[PDB]
Amino acid sequence: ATTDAECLSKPAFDGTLSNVWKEGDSRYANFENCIYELSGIGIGYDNDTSWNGHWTPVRAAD
């Protein structure tokens, strides 16, 4: 299990994450029980489900 403060302490990376979901024109993905937010220059594939760009952690996996 992960907490919100544990996730927010992790660094932001530049790469690709799969199983990406939308939340009002904003993209989110789950990685190591932490939810990351897509920003920067985005390049998407796998029918909007795989996004490459800047991923910043926002919260923990529910």
Side-chain angles (χ1 to χ4, degrees), residues 16-22 27-31 45-46 48-51 55:
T16 322
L17 287 181
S18 293
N19 300 293
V20 178
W21 72 90
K22 281 172 80 181
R27 276 142 188 89
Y28 300 92
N30 208 79
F31 178 75
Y45 64 97
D46 288 318
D48 217 342
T49 76
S50 291
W51 281 86
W55 294 98

Side-chain angles (χ1 to χ4, degrees), residues 8-61:
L8 287 159
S9 301
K10 288 180 180 176
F13 65 94
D14 292 296
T16 322
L17 287 181
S18 293
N19 300 293
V20 178
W21 72 90
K22 281 172 80 181
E23 257 185 73
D25 297 288
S26 299
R27 276 142 188 89
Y28 300 92
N30 208 79
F31 178 75
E32 291 185 307
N33 296 325
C34 291
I35 295 152
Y36 292 86
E37 185 168 40
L38 178 78
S39 58
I41 301 156
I43 297 150
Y45 64 97
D46 288 318
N47 178 47
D48 217 342
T49 76
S50 291
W51 281 86
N52 176 85
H54 194 247
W55 294 98
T56 304
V58 292
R59 69 179 186 269

